[PDB]
Design a binder for these strands. Sequence first.
RNA 1: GUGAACGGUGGAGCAACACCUGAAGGAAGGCUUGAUGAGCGUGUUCCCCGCAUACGCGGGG
Lengths: 322, 234
Amino acid sequence: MQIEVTVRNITPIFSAAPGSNYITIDGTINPPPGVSRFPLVRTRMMYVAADVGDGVIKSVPLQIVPGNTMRSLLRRTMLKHVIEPALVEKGNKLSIGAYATAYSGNATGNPDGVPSSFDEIATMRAHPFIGLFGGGPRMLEGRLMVDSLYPIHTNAERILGAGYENEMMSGPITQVVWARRMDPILNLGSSEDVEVINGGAVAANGWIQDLLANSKGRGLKAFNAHEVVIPGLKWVWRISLDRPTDAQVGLVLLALNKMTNERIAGGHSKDYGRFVIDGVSLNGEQVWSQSGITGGEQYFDAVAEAIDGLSSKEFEQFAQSA
Amino acid sequence: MFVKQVFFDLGARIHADEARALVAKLLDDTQPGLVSALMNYMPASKTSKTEFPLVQFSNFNQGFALLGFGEVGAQILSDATPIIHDAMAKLFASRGQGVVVQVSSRDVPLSCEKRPYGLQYTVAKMVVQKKHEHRERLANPETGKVFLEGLFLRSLERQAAAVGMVLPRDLVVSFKGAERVSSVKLRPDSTLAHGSLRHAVFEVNARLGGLWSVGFLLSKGFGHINTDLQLGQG
RNA sequence: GUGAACGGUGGAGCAACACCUGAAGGAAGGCUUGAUGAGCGUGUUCCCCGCAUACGCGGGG
């Protein structure tokens, strides 16, 4: 079951790579030491084979949002307003281990060395939530197969190829945005602002005096950067499912109906990662309109009678460890 | 090498000479070594060194500035800054409601190169006068330009020798124009005065770096300006 | 004229068949690039330090 979600970013997208890189004033990512480099946390990035010339492909760098991030996103939005409202609406409450297995996939770090019975796997598998997301102490397999969000870009022409004849981004698609820190005590220069302090002017002068010793216990007032994809470009997402029930597909579609208010990226204090869905292809047919998904009726009905009757006994026997 | 520049924000502008006097007054009773170093005093007596003052007071629109030339001057400023800030804190919190003393600190490097084209640099509040022979030199123009020539070149040479880097010795200067002639006094209500030049302009074929101080009475806050801002003024 | 002299360890024989390294996990929170050095006061003979060796030069406030 192939779901091709084409979206368009409203604000820019910043999904940070764990590698700590550095940047000078005008470009020069990762300079040599001794240039007074600033810290930089780049947007995360897969390489991709691309035709940069006449039929020769290179591993050009592509900045994306990873599949684990938006798998956690899709799990969190479906468990935030499709499953847990249905859990608390009829009064059932998850256990603390059941909550840990619902959100993270495991209760503790240590799993069971034993295997579970097949009747358990038959209950939890082919289910609206535990079928899609496995885990627990027995490491149950999850039906749902969440890919990363590539941009529609010429470097990703080899990915989802022989499509989008026009509307293909070819230029540079990123920007480095600088964020500086202020020390608020330093930027006062008034009595009305320091009348609020316990201690007042002498306390502010003492903290500034400590900052004088620490200028030449990490202080404030830094000036850093982050490398961020530009906004307003098309992105594609793929969701896959092997032998899915109609309730599982309906739960994915209900999460994706109201996906538009959630955060695909990090750095959400700068509102980074707002996206508007251009369309949703359900095995190639366009099912997205302005008022959510039109089409896929049986999936919505099956998840409608599936989330009713969704107790927490199954979550509790999921999270129970031998 | 580099010069350390520290700005203090007292909320109201006080001049550099009264800042030096105010700082010498408040730290007179306690901690004599740091005020002796910041005043460039003798290790045994109260008399200042005849050499280049490594640290010096300067001008600031919301307060006063301090300049420490070289590693020794930068170290002196870095050790002496928090007790100075605590002193202005207690002084401005003793009377009135109380203000907060804000700080700034920069480390401006020194550099010089030579190009075969003269360059414009202006200096304000420049003191040229210490002796009666310099009155006799400034009375006639022809023997006055050469005195200003030698003074500017030897001032560049002495600060370059003090901070520890090599000056090219093929430099030629020229003095074009003057705007005003005014006196500076040594202490308040004193009859003795020193002649001084207001808005002098000079033309040097070399490139001039920031915190480049010329003339006499450098520790009192005269004859220094940043040449980096004057180079490509925006 | 060595209880010596003279005497091939040889031939052939397939370590092989069948097993998916996996499973399930959000780099993410919080954080002014535009101010800091650029424009505004002093009116005449005085401390101290070196080179000299006083005929004077240089300079610190």
